[PDB]
Design a binder for this molecule. Structure first.
Ligand SMILES: CC(=O)N[C@H]1[C@@H](OP(=O)(O)OP(=O)(O)OC[C@H]2O[C@@H](n3ccc(=O)[nH]c3=O)[C@H](O)[C@@H]2O)O[C@H](CO)[C@@H](O)[C@@H]1O[C@H](C)C(=O)N[C@@H](C)C(=O)O
Ligand SMILES: Nc1ncnc2c1ncn2[C@@H]1O[C@H](COP(=O)(O)OP(=O)(O)O)[C@@H](O)[C@H]1O
Ligand SMILES: [Mg+2]
Ligand SMILES: [Mg+2]
Length: 429
């Protein structure tokens, strides 16, 4: 693509905005940057030469722009951005800039839950094949930083937000893993508007990998995975099966849980479509131990398991933690943070009985305590909740951080809440 002499404006001074600043500067284009916060995270890391505006969006700069590059954390529906769009000014995100440059096939992964797990699995399958693979996107490594002429395959975790501003993706294999309510504070037209953002991933995809059990993942390019049905499915010992044959006894996997078995099926379907050898892909499934903060046991001490599921940021992932969960004693369940306008009431059916205690914190703590107020306590912070529950923990109990919310209302970055839980569990357990 050619950006020479164009007036380029970047919105957002986080990971994405800084990677876009570096991208343009390395092409001889000096962008201008703005952020609605007065001191965004990347402000200190911004080159001196780059003009910046903070504390609001600058409409003079936006309406003067040839190209607006919007970070995923700002809505296209922001009035300033809709005014620019109405004026015919091109708006893209970093994933769009990436696609225009990439010189290797892209595997693209979205869905309400499981994206990082499936992204990492496909990455491990490529490494087991000896393929030079770049893994990035919403997983936390900005896609523009992957670009490398040696790279032979790209695997991108894509959020619904990133997909909204992307128009040139032509994935070799793309998936929507599942669609359940999330990000409703950014989708005023409801679940179908949220779904429509994710459906963009299939546009011009060579193969579409859909969830046989979730009709909202449907867009002949379509290969399905599922539990009892699908081209890739399970048979219960549980086996992964592909189109009529056993490929793996899940006793060989380090992951467990049905949703992780179907994560493995989706990852295998994407890897197969990307042309990776079946045998090394299956080997990767058996070596992968799971990402930190995704239902991760961080401490087993004195008869008590402390489980860090900090990456459960919506009702669907917390349901997956709770459904069929075995606890010998009491479950001490930590919930709270930024609930993104979610309806939490689907969690209520898991919270009956004499063996569960809720410790709710953060912005939407009261809304979560209302699920079953008689067994709930509310604090301001997670650390307060942890120090409250720690005296009550008995041998046989489980302490689960599975908050059903984003962390941004109280935590500085996207790893901090999980890191803090780990540190406090070690201190307190
Ligand atoms: C909110 C979001 O989409 N975050 C993704 C983003 O990180 P980055 O630091 O660039 O974020 P950002 O776009 O600057 O937005 C972060 C926050 O800054 C704030 N923000 C942003 C710009 C601005 O002008 N004003 C403002 O207040 C918003 O509160 C926003 O929530 O780009 C990174 C690299 O691609 C991603 O790893 C990261 O995913 C995280 C882990 C995440 O929470 N993503 C959400 C979407 C999710 O998984 O549900
Ligand atoms: N397919 C799935 N369905 C429901 N929950 C899932 C699924 N895969 C993983 N989880 C849970 O989703 C939450 C985040 O997992 P992650 O792999 O990081 O997905 P994402 O990148 O989409 O947020 C964690 O609580 C994890 O246990
Ligand atoms: Mg999300
Ligand atoms: Mg993720």
């Amino acid at each position: 693509a050619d950006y020479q002499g164009k007036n380029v404006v970047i919105i957002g001074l986080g990971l994405t905005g800084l990677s876009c600043v570096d991208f343009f500067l390395a092409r001889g284009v000096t962008p201008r940057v703005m952020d609605t916060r007065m001191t965004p995270p990347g402000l200190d890391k911004l080159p001196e030469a780059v003009e910046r505006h903070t504390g609001s969006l600058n409409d003079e700069w936006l309406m003067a722009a040839d190209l607006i590059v919007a970070s995923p954390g700002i809505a296209l529906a922001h009035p300033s951005l809709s005014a620019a769009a109405d004026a015919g000014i091109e708006i893209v995100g970093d994933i769009e800039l990436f696609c225009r440059e990439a010189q290797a096939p892209i595997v693209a992964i979205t869905g309400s839950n499981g994206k990082s797990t499936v992204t990492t699995l496909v990455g491990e399958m490529a490494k087991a094949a000896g393929v030079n693979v770049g893994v990035g996107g919403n997983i936390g490594l900005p896609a523009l930083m992957l670009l490398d002429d040696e790279c032979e395959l790209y695997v991108l975790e894509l959020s619904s937000f990133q997909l909204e501003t992307t128009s040139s993706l032509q994935a070799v294999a793309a998936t929507i893993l599942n669609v359940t309510e999330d990000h409703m504070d950014r989708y005023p037209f409801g679940l179908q508007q949220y779904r429509a953002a994710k459906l963009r991933i299939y546009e011009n995809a060579k193969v579409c990998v859909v969830n046989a059990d979730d009709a909202l993942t449907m867009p002949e390019r379509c290969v399905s995975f599922g539990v009892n049905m699908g081209d890739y499915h399970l048979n219960h010992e549980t086996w992964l099966r592909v189109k009529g044959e056993k490929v793996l006894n899940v006793k060989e996997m380090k992951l467990s849980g049905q949703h992780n078995y179907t994560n493995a099926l989706a990852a295998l379907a994407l890897a197969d479509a990307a042309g990776l050898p079946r045998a090394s892909s299956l080997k990767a499934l058996t070596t992968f131990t799971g990402l930190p903060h995704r239902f991760e046991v961080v401490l087993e001490h004195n008869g008590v398991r402390w489980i860090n599921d900090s990456k459960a940021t919506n009702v669907g992932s917390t349901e997956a933690a709770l459904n069929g969960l075995h606890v010998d004693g009491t479950l001490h369940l930590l919930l709270g943070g930024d609930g993104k306008s979610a309806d939490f009431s689907p969690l209520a059916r898991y919270l009956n009985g004499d063996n569960v205690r809720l410790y709710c914190f953060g912005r939407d703590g009261a809304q979560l305590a209302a699920l079953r107020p008689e067994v709930a306590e509310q604090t301001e912070t997670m650390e307060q909740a942890m120090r409250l529950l720690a005296p009550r923990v008995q041998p046989g109990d489980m302490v689960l951080l599975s908050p059903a919310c984003a962390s941004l209302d109280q935590f500085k970055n996207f790893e901090q809440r999980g890191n803090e839980f780990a540190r406090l569990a070690k201190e307190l357990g």
